[PDB]
A paper describes a structure:
Phenylpyrazolo-pyrimidone compounds 34, 35, and 36, analogs of hit 13, engaged JAK2 JH2 domain with selectivity over JH1. The compounds that targeted JH2 domain shared a trifluoro-group as R1. Diaminotriazole analog 18, diaminotriazine compounds 4 and 24, and phenylpyrazolo-pyrimidone analogs 34 and 36 targeted JAK2 JH2 with selectivity over JH1, although the affinity of these compounds to JH2 domain was micromolar and thus lower compared to the JH1-targeting compounds 1 and 2. All compounds bind to the hinge via three hydrogen bonds (H-bonds) with the exception of 36, which makes only one hydrogen bond to the backbone amide nitrogen of Val629. Phenylpyrazolo-pyrimidone compounds identified in the present study are a novel finding for JH2-selective binders of JAK2. The affinity of phenylpyrazolo-pyrimidone compounds as well as of other JH2-selective small molecules to JAK2 JH2 was rather low, in the micromolar range.
JAK2, like other JAK family members, comprises a catalytically active C-terminal tyrosine kinase domain (JH1), a regulatory pseudokinase domain (JH2), and a Src homology-2 (SH2)-like domain that, together with the N-terminal FERM (N-terminal 4.1, ezrin, radixin, moesin) domain, forms the major receptor interaction moiety. The JH2 domain has a key role in mediating both negative and positive regulation of JAK kinase activity and numerous disease mutations locate in JH2, including the prevalent hyperactivating JAK2 V617F in MPN. Previous studies have demonstrated that JAK2 JH2 binds ATP and possesses regulatory autophosphorylation activity on Ser523 and Tyr570. To gain insights on the compound binding modes to JAK2 JH2 and to analyze whether any differences could be observed between binding to WT and V617F, we determined the crystal structures of selected small molecules with JAK2 JH2 WT and V617F.
Numbering used by the authors: 536 to 808
Write the structure that this text describes.
Amino acid sequence: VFHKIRNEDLIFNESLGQGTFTKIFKGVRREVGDYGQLHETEVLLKVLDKAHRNYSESFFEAASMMSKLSHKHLVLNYGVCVCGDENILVQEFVKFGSLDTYLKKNKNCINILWKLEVAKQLAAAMHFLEENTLIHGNVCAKNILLIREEDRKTGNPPFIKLSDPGISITVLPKDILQERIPWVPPECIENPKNLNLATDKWSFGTTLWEICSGGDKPLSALDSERKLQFYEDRHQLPAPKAAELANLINNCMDYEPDHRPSFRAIIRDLNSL
Ligand SMILES: O=C1CC(c2ccccc2)=Nc2c(-c3ccccc3)c(C(F)(F)F)nn21
């Protein structure tokens, strides 16, 4: 599928952070757009670490999956650039960046109706993926991007998009999956081949907890061994102090995967608030 983009049409600018075996940059893509018009377009650039180029297949598959669907709550993929040892994904630049950092910076002016709207949008995206039997596999607030802020004065809601999952937990080292507790569900800790649609219901619950906790990271105080034992003892997350969504979080984070609710049922629960 992927449009091949020339290295010379890509400029790398500021470093924005990192993902698993990747570095993330803002950049600019020079392109011919619709009517033959030349454009300099802001792009989000993800670079697979040279030392991990043996994961390149899973790195690109994560984006290819998303790019074969179109949906207003999914980030657009523009193409790839493979410059010898560099494996580069080129994607839409989303103005206000990651939800997790946005929640922390603005936690004092984000109320329950803003959280509810964002949860509803995320659920709409996940229902779309579920209807298409497409597993995401890394739903978390870091991977949700805010394209538009709420505008009180015009009643405009915030608007979010979900980015691609990155390299799959089916191929990642077990130590990384343990650090990713409690977004990674207990059955995938047992066996990463247990990755299924029910995975995304668990992770959606962890992500709602983030949205409700002002950007805190659940269980961050626990090292990997205690995270593993958290699953062994079958604990649940503490209610967010803003507890309106606590019941939904706990229903999604069901240790029995087959009992986790459909995204249709999840949306019905959200709309009754
Ligand atoms: O489009 C954007 C825009 C963006 C951004 C960052 C800082 C200020 C304004 C926007 N930050 C990101 C990330 C990102 C995620 C985790 C750590 C660092 C950056 C992603 C990604 F695709 F990687 F999810 N897209 N994105």
